[model samples]
Target: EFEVLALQASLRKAQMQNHSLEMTLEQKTKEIDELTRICDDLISKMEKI
Candidate 1:
């Protein structure tokens, strides 16, 4: 349980980092959006599991 929780937290943190990175690299809008969506989906799936 602890391990899963930690993983979830880590995933969430990574997603946040990705979001910030996307924002910082606004020139690559489309790719950043795609990556953001993927990160969101991954975080959701991780929580569901």
Candidate 2:
């Protein structure tokens, strides 16, 4: 009844969005928001090409 499934669906959306954002933007690295571990996403752009 707490709707964890709905949250899981949104989790996939978040992953896709995170991957897409990390792929194309240096600013995605500069964001420095939320968790600091996200710092590593800067490499996601390089993997695109």
Candidate 3:
């Protein structure tokens, strides 16, 4: 029983860490998307030149 309780606690901590990583991943995804848009715009301008 004690082992089970300990395992549950460990699982909970791991889940929390996973949630934090997911949030960071989402933020990075947004940043990458914005950078992609800027890159596309620059490419369009370069093509014109």
Which ranges in model 3 have alpha carbons more than 4 Å from their true place?
A: none
List CA RMSD, all candidates.
18.9, 14.3, 0.7
Query: Candidate 2 or 3, higher lDDT?
Result: 3
The models' CA-based lDDT, in order, is 0.92, 0.74, 0.99
Q: Which candidate would rank higher by lDDT, 1 or 2?
A: 1
Candidate order by lDDT, highest to lowest?
3, 1, 2
Indicate the worst ten consecutive residues by lDDT in candidate 1: 23-32
Tens digits of lDDT, candidate 2, 1-49? 5699899899999999988887767666556563465555656756785
Clashing pairs in 2: none
Error of 2 at 44 (Å): 31
TM-score of each: 0.51, 0.42, 0.92
Q: Rank the candidates by TM-score, best first.
A: 3, 1, 2
Considering every candidate listed, which one attains the maximal TM-score?
3
User: What TM-score would candidate 3 get against the native?
Assistant: 0.92
